[PDB]
Design a protein around this nucleic acid. Structure first.
Lengths: 71, 171, 135, 98, 71, 104, 53
RNA sequence: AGGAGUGGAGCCUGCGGCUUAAUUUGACCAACACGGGAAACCUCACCCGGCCCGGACACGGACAGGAUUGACAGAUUGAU
RNA sequence: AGCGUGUGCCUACCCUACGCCGGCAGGCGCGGGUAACCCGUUGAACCCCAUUCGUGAUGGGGAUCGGGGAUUGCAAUUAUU
């Protein structure tokens, strides 16, 4: 219906070969795959995911808190 | 103005040349009674008037010193020949020549002498030569290894306002 | 490599094309498969003495017995795109002192070498010291 | 080498003709631009001057990342004998200034 | 700050040891000089510098990045 | 011939500048070359605002320095010979001068 | 020397210095200056600037 | 007398503590977006590997079939 | 609107008009400026006027995070922008 490719959520998903638009319950399923993939290869990404720490370049020294348990 | 620099950068570049020279000379003419310079570009010539108190020691044997110095400057800033020409000049009244008076105190000290007597000798001279007043400080070690200060003061002095720019020189 | 269904078969071909096609492709067709940052490194770079690595990998892969992996090629280079041709080799990657060895999968392609070798201890507390609280 | 025996001469002869040398403090001066090119590969001016200076024959200032070497009477004799040259040369002095 | 610790390797390339050099010309008859290998006529050699007959190689120290056969 | 020649002056000292401008307007008016007076151009500010402390410690203070240059230009129309005559005379202090071939 | 003795530095901090001591970081680039801020002050009076405000 | 805030939330950034091969270092109203210090490399002081001498000068020794410099290919090596 | 700034400087680099291509980031072709001359009569923001939302953790808030495209550099992984 001639909505441009750049205006979609996904362009060449990766390993699926096409432009795609993802909606509600399929979005979560797709999302959980990419997490699993990055622990499959076990890049830096999946390790940070599994440890529950920030993926992107951010300091965690003064961030997140919550917390409790002090000395 | 090719290949030269714009007017903002033009004055800055002059200042850098004025400053480098003024510390270059001071490390090899101090004992000959250096007191500054005064440069003047004129049509097709640079004049660098090497102001010093005693022209005797400046000259050397057959104008040797002036010749060495001119050959240096001619290469360092990369001017072609016939540009830079040094000249000497004797300054009358040395009691207003703070820079030279300071360097006289330097060699009196390095001669091996006490501080009070040396300071006194420099003091009366600059006062006698004609001055409103004058002051000397020597801060550093002597007779122990805690530092101290010894101030020797005579006459009038100012320290505040714009007149400070006219009526005192400091080294 | 001992995986299945990650680059061929039912479930997963690498953006619509199998590994088998990639190996016959030049870098030119390969880079146009969407992975933006990769395309900089090829179009600008074009081999700044990565020569030393890529010959040793193919070489060692060849001479090694069938159904057995080679020894290692080592690197201080943590940067170089993982590629289909590189797969099956075993590479040790310098950290600050230590060469952590890794097997190259066909599922790692596009990534860098340095993501598969860490360079710090994950972390493990803990106990407040004698100087950590206005008290 | 250290340096060639060629590059000794090309500095020491040039020094003898101008009566003074200057250079800048760098260990990455490929040819020493300003003076003499295609016969200095790197340090060499500074590196050869230091050895000369050790044995007298020169005085040396340093100011704002620039050496300044002043040839002396003793050095005139030295350079004359080292390169076995005629007795006519002395550019440091040759006239009494008027 | 701190001073160096302990390695144990401590070798030198070789001192270019003092040997009886030039018998690259061999005495057979008078006044003939019997060459076994060429005294190289490179593109800047004056034919006063020999070329090494390495065995498995052909190497000059002057033409060292060029004019090196493997025979 | 008679060429429209523009003599730009530039200096850092307003007294030293201005009297040398007056001299060049005089030497022109003396020979009745129909010169135009000084056109004083906007004075420009070079600023440097930096810390007074070497190695930060104590209250944060700064210091405004300024240098003010001055530009001004006199337009002449006369033969280029007599121009270079009158230009070179009666200048003693450190003040720059720039002669121009022609102007519209 | 040979093929290793240097690594390209032609932008960033390591490819500029200063002309009165060759010190880096704290320096003034502006107007073609190339002087480190500690030493700039001591040659401030020497033709350059003067305080006025 | 009042005005707007800070202290609460999220983030940025400096400091302590803790960890770590190393998390370089100064500083405790008058330290703490301070060292004009917004660090990819460089910087760089730190940590882990490898190379280089650019040890002047002096005295003695070596030594012209020779004091000494550099390197192709293979092995070795992150490394040509 | 106002203070400024700009390649010809260190070892190498500036400010950009204009035309074209692209949703955007941007690319590409030409031209001026050593500067009261060219960029730039610096046609900036809050402000101002008319639509839409409706007291609702709402479209307030944009943290966190997935996927993709550009530019700088020799290189961007711990995501430079």
């Amino acid at each position: 219906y001639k909505i441009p490719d750049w205006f979609l959520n996904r362009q060449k998903d990766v390993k699926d070969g096409k432009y795609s638009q993802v909606l509600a319950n399929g979005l979560d399923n797709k999302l959980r795959e990419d997490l699993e993939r990055l622990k499959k290869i076990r890049a830096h990404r999946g390790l940070r995911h599994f440890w529950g720490l920030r993926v992107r370049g951010q300091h965690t020294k003064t961030t997140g808190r919550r917390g409790r348990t002090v000395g | 103005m090719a290949v030269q620099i714009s007017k903002k950068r033009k004055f800055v570049a002059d200042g850098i040349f004025k400053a480098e020279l003024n510390e270059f000379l001071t490390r090899e003419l101090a004992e000959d009674g250096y007191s500054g310079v005064e440069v003047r570009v004129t049509p097709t010539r640079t004049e660098i008037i090497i102001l010093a108190t005693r022209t005797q020691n400046v000259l050397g044997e057959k104008g040797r010193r002036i010749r060495e110095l001119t050959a240096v400057v001619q290469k360092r800033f990369g001017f072609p020949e016939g540009s830079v020409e040094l000249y000497a000049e004797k300054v009358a009244t040395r009691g207003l020549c703070a820079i030279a008076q300071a360097e006289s105190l330097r060699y009196k000290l390095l001669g091996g002498l006490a501080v009070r007597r040396a300071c006194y000798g420099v003091l009366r001279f600059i006062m006698e030569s004609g001055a409103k007043g004058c002051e000397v400080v020597v801060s550093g070690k002597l007779r122990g290894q805690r530092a101290k200060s010894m101030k020797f003061v005579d006459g009038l002095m100012i320290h505040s306002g714009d007149p400070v720019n006219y009526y005192v020189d400091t080294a | 490599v001992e995986q299945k269904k990650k680059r061929t078969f039912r479930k997963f071909t690498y953006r619509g094309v199998d590994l088998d096609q990639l190996l016959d492709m030049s870098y030119e067709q390969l880079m146009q498969l969407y992975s933006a940052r990769q395309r900089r490194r090829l179009s600008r770079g074009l081999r700044r003495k990565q020569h030393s690595l890529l010959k040793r990998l193919r070489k060692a892969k060849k001479e090694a017995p069938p159904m057995e992996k080679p020894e290692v090629v080592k690197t201080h280079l943590r940067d170089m795109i993982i590629l289909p041709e590189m797969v099956g080799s075993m590479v040790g990657v310098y950290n600050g002192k230590t060469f952590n060895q890794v097997e190259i999968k066909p599922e790692m392609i596009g990534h860098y070498l340095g993501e598969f070798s860490i360079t710090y201890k994950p972390v493990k507390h803990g106990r407040p010291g004698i100087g950590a609280t206005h008290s | 080498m250290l340096m060639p025996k060629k590059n000794r001469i090309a500095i020491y002869e040039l020094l003898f003709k101008e009566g003074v040398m200057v250079a800048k403090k760098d260990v990455h001066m490929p040819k020493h631009p300003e003076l003499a090119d295609k016969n200095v590969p790197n340090l060499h001016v500074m590196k050869a001057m230091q050895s000369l200076k050790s044995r007298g024959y020169v005085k040396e200032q340093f100011a704002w990342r620039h050496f300044y070497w002043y040839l002396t009477n003793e050095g005139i004799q030295y350079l004359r004998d080292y390169l076995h040259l005629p007795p006519e040369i002395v550019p440091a002095t040759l006239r009494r200034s008027r | 700050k701190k001073s160096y610790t302990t390695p144990k390797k401590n070798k030198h390339k070789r001192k270019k040891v003092k040997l009886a050099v030039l018998k690259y010309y061999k005495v057979d008859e008078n006044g003939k000089i019997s060459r076994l290998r060429r005294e190289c006529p490179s593109d800047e050699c004056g034919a006063g510098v020999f070329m090494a007959s390495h065995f498995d190689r052909h190497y000059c120290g002057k033409c060292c990045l060029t004019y090196c056969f493997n025979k | 011939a008679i060429h429209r020649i523009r003599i730009t002056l530039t200096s850092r000292n307003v007294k030293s500048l201005e009297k040398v401008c007056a001299d060049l307007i005089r030497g022109a008016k003396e020979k009745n070359l129909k010169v135009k007076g000084p056109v004083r151009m906007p004075t420009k500010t070079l600023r440097i605002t930096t810390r007074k402390t070497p190695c930060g410690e104590g209250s944060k203070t700064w210091d405004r320095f300024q240098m003010r240059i001055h530009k001004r230009l006199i337009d002449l129309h006369s033969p280029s010979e007599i121009v270079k005559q009158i230009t070179s005379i009666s200048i003693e202090p450190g003040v720059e001068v720039e002669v121009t071939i022609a102007d519209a | 020397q040979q093929l290793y003795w240097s690594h390209p530095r032609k932008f960033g901090q390591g490819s500029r210095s200063c002309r009165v001591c060759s010190n880096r970081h704290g320096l003034i680039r502006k107007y073609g200056l190339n002087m480190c801020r500690q030493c700039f002050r001591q040659y401030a009076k020497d033709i350059g600037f003067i305080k006025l405000d």
